[PDB]
C-alpha cells in the first residue's frame, strides 16, 4: 500500500536535548497518522475489494456490455435525480486523494517548525545549560567557609551577616549570562514560529470541518442512483436510455471514515488550544527553590511585563531538559524541603550529597 | 496486512534500569497481541478468501444479477426472521473493527503508565541506587577493625559495647537518605498510577465480556437467513420478492475467534488480580540480612501502618534491579548464611571477596 | 502468510555467558520450527491455493448454484458413508490450527526455562568464574619459588613432604568458595526446572503421537466423499438430494505433512533421551588435570553420592565456559601433558607461558 | 511497485560538515520525488486497476473475441477521427515511461555536482576551518595586555597609539592565509560548475513544459475513440470493419497527473531562480563583528570586484558550517553587542566566557 | 520479484583505502544495473500483465478450448510462414533468461578483480602510505636549519652547496622504499588483472552486440503469426488445421528493451576504452611539487621505459588515496606555489602550518 511507506517517510522518529514537548509530539503523531490509518483501513484486505459499484443490467446484456456499463459511470459519477436536476457524487471517488492532501497539509507546519526555529533554539539551550552546569562546581567552593564559620558565630553572623559579602563576592556573578537573558527578553523572533505552528493546525482543522460539512453530510444516506450512457455515439442504439438502479456497496466505509475523521479532530482541538494557552501566563511553580540558588535566581528575577517573550519559550524548553544527567541530581533531590528554619538542614543536605 | 504494521507499532520492545516487571510485561504482551493475532488469522491465507456471503439465486438469473443480489446484502445484513420480526447480523461484519478497537483500548493504559510515573520513578531509583552503592565501602573498611581487636579483648567489651559507637559515628549514618525516605513515605502520587493501570485493564476485560455476551452468543449457530431486495427502486420488478437460502461462509472462524477471545482473558484475569494484590502487604523475605548492612538498615526500618505508599512500589522496583552490575555482587552471595555465631563467619565472608 | 511473522517472533537468536547447553539448542530449534515450516509448506505458491474441495455438479446447474453447492460443504465436512454411518472429514480443515497449536505448545517449555532458572544460574556462574579467574595467578606466587628447591634437593624430603606444606599452607585456600559450593550442592531448586523442561517435551511429543494416531491414519487413502445439501431451507427444492463424487484435491499435502511430522519427531526423541540422561552421572573426563590445578581441585573434590544436585548443573554449564577469553588460555594448552615426572616439565610449560 | 525501490536508490539520505544547503535539499527532494510519487499513485491500489481500455463489442462476439478486440488496440492506440485523418493517443501509453525519464533527468545534475565539485571544494573548507579556528586563543591573549595598560593610562594612548603595533605584530598577522585568499580571488574553476548545476535544472524544466504543451493538452477532453481491426490477416472476415465506442477508463488520473506536474514545477521555478541569484551579491549582513577578530578580518577585507569568484561559494558554504561544535561558541554569543564603547564591555564579555 | 533481491545480491555497496576508481564504480554500476532494471520494467505492474499471446479462435469453440489452443502455442512459438518455410519466434520467450545471463556475465569480471588483485594491492598501498607518512617531520624537522643560517651567509655557501650534504645524510634517504619500488617496477603480475578485467567487459559487449544482431532485428516489426495444433493425438479431429491471426501482445516492451540495451552499451563503451588507455601513459601532471619533498622524490625519479608495469597502477591507485586524513594536509595545500624564488616562500609556507 502507498500509505505504508509514507508512514515512516513523514511521522518517523543535539544528542542530549529534547526539542519537542511530549504533548506536541503526541498531537503531531496522531494528526498525521489518523488519515493514513483511515486510508489504509478503507482500501485493504479488511473489507473485500473488487468492483465497488454494482448495476442491475438487463438480462439481454452479456458480460462485456454490463462491464462497460458499470465501468463507464465511475469516471462520470452523476445522478440524474428526479426528486431533471443533476446531482454529483464525486466525494465517493475523491476520498483517498483528499485524505492524502489532508495528511500533507497537517505535516507542513512540522517542517515550518523544524526549519524556522530549531538551530537558534538549540544554540540558546546549549549555551544556557553550559552556564548552568558551571553552577554546582562554582557553588560548593564558594560555600565552604560558611560551613566552618557556622560553629564559630551566631545565626545573625552566619546566615544574616556572613552572606552579606560572601554571596555578593565575585565568584557566582555571571554578567554575560544576565546580559544575554536581558537581550533575549526583548526579542520576539521566536514566539512567532510557535504561534504560526499552532495557528496553521487550527486553520487546517477548521478547513477540514468546512470541507466535511459542505460536500459530505448530503450524500450520506443515499445508496441508489440512476446513470445514463446515451450521451455520445452510443445514443444511436436500441437499449435503455437511462440506466436503472446502480448501487454503491462501500457506503459503510464512507460513513465510518467520516465519523472517525470528525471525532479525532473534535477530540484533538482542546489539546492544541491548551498548548496555545500555555504561553499566555508566566510560570513560578518552582521559583521558591530557584530564588535561593545563586544562579537560578537570575531566571526568577526577570519576571515582568507581558509573558509573550522568547525567554518564556527558552524556560519552557529548559524545564523539560533540567533532568538530563547532571542537573538530574541534587536539583531534583531538593523536594524534601517543602513545608530561621533553613539555618541547619538547608546546608547539611547540600554538603552531604556532593557527588 | 495492517495487523503486521500494528504489531511492531504497538507491542515493540535509563540504560541500567528495568522499569517494567516481568509479569506486567507478559500481561501487556498477551493482552495486546491476542486480538491482533486473532484478526490476522481470521483474514489470512490460512482459510481461503472470496465472498463471505453466498446466495442461491434462481437459474433464470445471470452472473451479474446474482453478483448484485449477493452484494446488496453484505452491506445490509438483515434477516427477515419468521421464527415477521426482522433480526440483524451486524457482528459478522463488525468483528475486525471491534478487534482493532479492543487492541487499542488494551494498549491505552500502557501509555498512561509510561507518561505519568516513569520519569519520577526513574529519578527516585537512580538516586537511591547511587547512594546505596556507597554502602559497600562502609562495612569492611570501617568495621574491619572489629576482629582485629576481638582477639585481644573479651565478649562484653569488644562485641556488645564496642560495637555501639562505631555504629553511631559519622561514617555509618546517612541522614539525607533517611529524610528522603521519610518524605517519600508520606507521598501517594505514585501508587495511584499503578492502581489505575490495573483497574483500567480490569474494566476493559469486563467491557469485553459484556460486549461478547450481549451481542454474540445469539447469532452463534444460525448460518442461514433470508433477505429482501425489493425495498426501493427494485420493488417494481418481476422476480422473487424475498431471497432464499443465503448462507454465511465463515461461521467457523467466528466461533473460533469468540472462543479464543473468551479463553485468553479468562485465564489472564487471575494474573492481573495477583499483580494488584502484590502491593497490599509489606515484603520482608530478605530483611534478616538487610537489618545488618550500614545503609540497608534504613529501608528495613520503615514498615509501619498501611503498605499503600510510594515506598512500597519503590522497594518492589528496586528489588528487581538489585542485581545489575555492582550490587550483582557480595549482596547476591550472602545466601550461605541461612540456618554469638556472627562473631567470625559474617566477617571473613565479608573481608574475603573484597573486589 | 502468517507463518513468517511467527518464525522470527518465536525462534529468533551476560555479554560473555551461555544459558543454553550446546546440543540442547537443536532439540528446541527442530521441534519448534518443524510444525511451523510444515504449515508454511502445506499451503504455499508451489502447491497453489484455490478450491480445496471439488464436486461434480450436474450439467443443468449454473456456475453460481454449483459454487454454492461445493462452498456449503467445505465448512460442513461430513461424509455420508454407506460402507448410513455419518463419518466426518474435519482434519482436512483443522490441520493448520493443529500445527499452530503444536508450535505454541512446543515453545512454552522454553519460556519456562528462560523465566524460572536464568537469573540464579547467571549469578552462580558469574561468582564462580570470578573465583576461578582469581585462581590463575597462584603458580607464580607461592608455587614458582617452591619448586625451585628440587635443584637443591632430590625429591623424598622436598617434593613429597614439603610440597604438601605449601599446599596445606593458606594461600591455596578460599573457604568462602568452599562454603558456596557446599551450600549449593544440597539445594535442588534448578534440577527440577531441567527435569520439567525435558518432561514437557516428552509428554508433548507423546500427545502429538496420540493425536496423529487416534484422529489421522483413518482418512488417509480416502479421496472421494458424498455430501448432502437438502438439510434445511433448501430441502423443499427439485434437485439432487445427495451430492455425488466430491473429491478432495489436497490429499497429497496431507500425506506428506503427516509423514514428515511423524519422521521429524521420531528422529528427535532419542536426542531428548540423551539430554535427560546426561545429568545422571558425574563427569570425570579431565579431572586428572583438575585435581592438580590451584582451585580446580575443590570442584573435583566434592564428588560423592547421588549426582542429582545443583552442583552437577553448575559443572555442566561451567565446562564449556572454560574457554571464553581468559580461561581460553594455558588451561586449553594443558593437553600436551597426556601420557617423578612433574618435576620440571609440568612447570616449564607454564613458566614459558606467563602472558 | 518499481517506484518504491527507486525512492531510496536515488533520493535517499567529512563527518562534521554540511556540503549542501537546506533549500537545495528541498529543491532536489521535490524535483526528484514528485514524478516518482505521481507514478506510484497512478498505478496503485488507490484506484481500481484492470483493463485501461474498454470497447462495446457487438453482442454476437464471444468473450475471447471481445478480449482480442480490446487487447489488440491498446498497443495500437490510433483514433480514426472523422472530425479520415487518423489521430494517435500514444501519450496515454507512454506517460509512466516519460515520468521515469523525467526522474532520471532530475537526478543527473545532482550526480554531476556530487562528482565534479566536491573534491575541489572539501579540502579548501577543511583547511580554512582549522586556520580560522586558530583565531580564538589568538584574540584573548593577543589583546590581553591592553587592559593591563588601560588602568595605568588614559586618553588615546592606550587604545589608539599603544594598540597600533600589536595590530601588525607578528602574532596577529597570518601570512599563509593572505596568499591563499589572493589566489582564490582570481580563480573561476568551481564558480563555473554551480551555474551548470542550476542551468541544467532550468533547461530541464523548460523541456518538461515543452513536452507538456506540445504533446498533452490536445487529448485532454477526449474519452471516446474508434479503431479498426481489419488491417491485416483479419481483413477477410465478416464482422465490423471499424470499432465503435472504445472508451478510455483512466482519463481522470491523466488529468490529475498533468495538473500536478505543471503545478509542482511552476512552484519550483522561483526557488531555483533565487538559488541562482544568491551568488550575484556580496554578503555583509554581520561583517561588523568579523572585521574586529584576528583571523576573521581577512575574509571581510577581501570583498572587491565582481562577486563571481571561488570566494563567494567558499563563504556561502562556510557560513552554514560556522556552528558545528567549536565555532558553535562565543562566536554565536556576539549578538548582544548590537546597537569609546569597546573599552570594557566587548572584553569583559570576552574574558568572562573562556570555556 | 527476483530483480528486487538480485539488485543487492550483486550490486550492493581496509577501513581507510579506496580500491576502486570512481569511473570504474560508475561503469560497473551501469553495466550491472541496466539488465535488472530493464527486466523489472518488462514484467512489472507498469504494463498490464496477463496472456502474452492472444488468438482469434472460431466462435464455435468453448472457453476451455480457446484457452488450450492459445496456451499450447506459447510453449511452441513457431510461425507457419507462407511468405511452407517454418520460422521461429523464441527470443520473445527467452528474453528474461537472456537478460539475467547478461547480468551475470557483466558481474563476472568484478569477482576476478576482487579475488585476484585486492590483497597485494592493499598490502602495497598500506606499506607505501605508512612509509610516506614519516616524510612530514623530515623536511620541516630537518631542513628547518636552512633559513636559520641563510641570513648570516651568502648566496653560494648556504643554499647551493650547504643544501647538498644534509640532503645526502641519514635523515633524507629511504633505502627500503627505493628497493621496494625497484623490485615492484619489474613485476607485471597485477597489470594483467586490469587488462583482463577490461577485456572481459569489451568481449561481453561484443557478444551482446552479436546476439542482438543475429537473433533480434529480424522479428521486430512482425506481430501476427499462424500456428498449427494438429501435429499429434489431436490431428484426427474435425476443426481448423491451422490457426488464424495469433497476435503478440508485448511487442512494444520488446522494442523498448532492445533499443535501450543497444543504446546504453554504445554509450558505455567509450568509458571502457578510456579506462583502458589511462594506463598507457605516465602521469606527470604534478611532478613539479613531488620533486623536492624528501620521500616524494623517489616516486618522481622512477619513470623510465614502457609504462606497462606495477608502478603505474600503484601510482594511479595512490593518487586517489593521497587525501585520506594525514596526507589530506599541507601536501594538498601546495597549490598556491603555481607560477631563487624558493628562497623564502618555499620555507615560510612549510614552517607556518606545522600541525
Swiss-Prot record, chains A, B, C, D, E:
Keyword Zinc-finger: no
Residue intervals passing through the bilayer: 29-49, 99-119, 201-221, 253-273
Keyword annotations of the record: Cell junction, Cell membrane, Endoplasmic reticulum, Gap junction, Glycoprotein, Ion channel, Ion transport, Membrane, Transmembrane, Transmembrane helix, Transport
Extracellular side: 50-98, 222-252
Residue ranges annotated as Cytoplasmic topological domain: 1-28, 120-200, 274-355
GO cellular-component term (any): gap junction
Location(s) in or outside the cell: Cell membrane; Cell junction, Gap junction; Endoplasmic reticulum membrane
Record InterPro entries: Innexin (IPR000990), Pannexin (IPR039099)
Catalytic reactions on record: Ca(2+)(in) = Ca(2+)(out); ATP(in) = ATP(out)
UniProt cross-references to PANTHER family, sorted A to Z: PANNEXIN, PANNEXIN-3
Complexes and interactors: Homoheptameric.
Protein name: Pannexin-3
Gene designation per UniProt: PANX3
Amino acid at each position: 500500500s502507498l500509505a505504508h511507506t509514507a508512514a515512516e517517510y513523514m511521522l518517523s522518529d543535539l544528542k542530549g536535548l529534547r526539542l519537542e514537548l511530549p504533548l506536541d509530539r503526541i498531537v503531531k503523531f496522531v494528526a498525521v497518522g489518523s488519515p493514513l490509518l483511515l486510508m489504509s483501513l478503507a482500501f485493504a484486505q479488511e473489507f473485500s475489494s473488487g468492483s465497488p459499484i454494482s448495476c442491475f443490467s438487463p438480462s439481454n446484456f452479456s458480460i462485456r456490455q454490463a462491464a462497460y456499463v458499470d465501468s463507464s459511470c465511475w469516471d462520470s459519477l452523476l445522478h440524474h435525480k428526479q426528486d431533471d436536476k443533476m446531482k454529483s457524487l464525486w466525494p465517493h471517488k475523491a476520498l483517498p486523494y483528499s485524505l492524502l492532501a489532508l495528511a500533507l497539509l497537517m505535516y507542513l507546519p512540522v517542517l515550518l517548525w523544524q526549519y524556522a526555529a530549531v538551530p537558534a533554539l538549540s544554540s540558546d539551550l546549549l549555551f544556557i545549560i553550559s552556564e548552568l552546569d558551571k553552577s554546582y562546581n562554582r557553588s560548593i567552593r564558594l560555600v565552604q567557609h560558611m560551613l566552618k564559620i557556622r560553629q564559630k558565630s551566631s545565626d545573625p553572623y552566619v546566615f544574616w551577616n556572613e552572606l552579606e559579602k560572601a554571596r555578593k563576592e565575585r565568584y557566582f556573578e555571571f554578567p554575560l549570562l544576565e546580559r544575554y537573558l536581558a537581550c533575549k527578553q526583548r526579542s520576539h523572533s521566536l514566539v512567532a514560529t510557535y504561534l504560526l505552528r499552532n495557528s496553521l493546525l487550527l486553520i487546517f482543522t477548521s478547513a477540514t470541518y468546512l470541507y466535511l460539512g459542505h460536500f459530505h453530510l448530503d450524500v450520506f444516506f443515499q445508496e441508489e442512483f440512476s446513470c445514463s450512457i446515451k450521451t455520445g455515439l452510443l445514443s444511436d442504439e436500441t437499449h435503455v436510455p437511462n440506466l436503472i438502479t446502480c448501487r454503491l456497496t462501500s457506503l459503510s466505509i464512507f460513513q465510518i471514515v467520516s465519523l472517525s475523521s470528525v471525532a479525532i479532530y473534535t477530540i484533538l482541538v482542546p489539546v492544541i488550544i491548551y498548548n496555545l494557552t500555555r504561553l499566555c501566563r508566566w510560570d513560578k511553580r518552582l521559583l521558591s527553590v530557584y530564588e535561593m540558588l545563586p544562579a537560578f535566581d537570575l531566571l526568577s528575577r526577570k519576571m515582568l511585563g507581558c509573558p509573550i517573550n522568547d525567554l518564556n519559550v527558552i524556560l519552557l524548553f529548559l524545564r523539560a531538559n533540567i533532568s538530563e544527567l547532571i542537573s538530574f541530581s541534587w536539583l531534583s533531590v531538593l523536594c524534601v524541603l517543602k513545608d530561621n528554619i533553613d539555618t541547619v538542614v538547608d546546608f547539611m543536605t547540600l554538603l552531604a550529597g556532593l557527588e
